[PDB]
Design a protein around this ligand. Structure first.
Ligand SMILES: *[C@@H]1O[C@H](CO)[C@@H](O)[C@H](O)[C@H]1NC(C)=O
Length: 377
């Protein structure tokens, strides 16, 4: 059992996975509580009044999704609510909040009342990102760093005496870490730091690349776009290993490659990949969409014999990089070897929870749990 282990397994739940057809539909009752130590609910958002509020009132309130996920506390799981996410981070509202001490003071008392009203065990901060709004460091003021650090302190001061948790999902990008994070403050105050060691590469690069490399690859344009660099950088900046939980993607980044008759890494790309039937997002495919293309649509799979990264798969002008069970076990061994706090997944609803691909239900997440519980490194 994971609840008896020395590691966390932090599972993100997404309320919008409900709005998918057929086998892609995901509900709170689909959560498998044997596979997580912590569940984080994505997402609440920052309202126009500077107060945390439900993003989807139809699901979160009218259909009681908050209560139906907090349900899983009865199994010994810690259930947190996440604030923010990529879409909520587009503008300046988080910046406006953290640069105004009076706005922070009002937000903090309301936020803890919000958590206690619905029974949440904690708050997860997912601002992407302080200073570098949606990764553009030219947008925000440097004071976002001190503002966010002070917000974390002020939340911790109210949450911790109540026994409530405080965590944050953070950038894997050296640039963002340098510009937006006061790492020693975050490392001291947060119960864990969920490092989003994925989306290193995607359609925005205009060439193919892996969503979540583990180690440096010779063809990389940087030394630092891999999980091994990222995790060591967080520690070098002052983060104890026990506070770090390493993110792992249950999905792939997809590409429409240019017509040049090649299919490897770093080949020119004209657009994101065609949307999947269930996830409906150009450039994105759930694992259960990827594994069906391999099994039943003849996509060719290319694996790294050195295991610096997971596989990629392609057919025609479509190309996708993702993590398979093999590289997942490698990443979890990495986690154990550095004595990190554990692992994190994005997201529950993107793994093959229905056993559509015949490897068993939740093949990626079960691979993580099995390897976390295996004493051998
Ligand atoms: C992982 O990163 C560490 C610290 O940056 C480095 O010493 C080591 O060479 C890396 N491991 C690889 C590339 O396999």
């Amino acid at each position: 059992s994971l609840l008896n282990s020395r590691y966390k397994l932090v599972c993100y739940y997404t309320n919008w996975s409900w709005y998918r057809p057929g086998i892609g539909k995901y509900s709170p009752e689909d959560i498998d509580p044997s596979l997580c130590t912590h569940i984080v609910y994505g997402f609440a958002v920052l309202g126009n009044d500077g107060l945390m509020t439900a993003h989807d009132t139809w699901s979160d309130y009218d259909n009681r999704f908050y209560e139906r996920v907090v349900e899983y506390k009865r199994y010994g799981i810690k259930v947190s609510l996440a604030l923010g996410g990529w879409n909520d981070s587009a503008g300046d509202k988080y910046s406006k909040l953290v640069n105004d001490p009076a706005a922070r003071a009002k937000f903090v008392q309301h936020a803890v009342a919000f958590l206690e009203k619905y029974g949440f065990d904690g708050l997860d901060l997912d601002w992407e990102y302080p200073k570098c709004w949606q990764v553009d460091c030219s947008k925000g003021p440097d004071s976002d760093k001190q503002g966010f650090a002070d917000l974390v302190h002020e939340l911790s001061a109210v949450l911790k005496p109540k026994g409530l948790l405080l965590s944050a999902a953070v950038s894997p990008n050296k640039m963002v870490i340098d510009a937006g994070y006061d790492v020693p403050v975050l490392a001291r105050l947060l119960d864990w730091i969920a490092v989003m060691t994925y989306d290193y590469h995607g359609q925005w690069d205009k060439k193919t690349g892996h969503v979540a490399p583990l180690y440096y690859h010779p063809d990389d344009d940087t030394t630092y776009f891999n999980a091994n660099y990222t995790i060591h950088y967080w520690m070098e900046k002052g983060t104890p290993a026990s506070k770090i939980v390493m993110g792992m993607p249950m999905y792939g980044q997809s590409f429409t490659i240019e017509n040049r008759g090649i299919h490897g890494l770093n080949i020119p790309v004209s657009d994101g990949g065609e949307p999947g039937e269930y996830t409906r997002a150009k450039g994105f495919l759930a694992y259960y969409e990827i594994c069906d293309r391999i099994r039943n649509s003849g996509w060719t799979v290319v694996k790294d014999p050195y295991q610096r990264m997971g596989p990629y798969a392609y057919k025609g002008n479509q190309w996708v990089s993702f993590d398979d069970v093999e590289i997942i076990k490698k990443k979890v061994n990495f986690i154990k070897s550095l004595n990190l706090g554990g692992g994190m997944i994005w997201a529950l609803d993107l793994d093959d929870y229905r056993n559509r691909c015949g490897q068993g239900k939740h093949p990626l997440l079960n691979a993580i749990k099995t390897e976390l519980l295996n004493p051998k490194i």
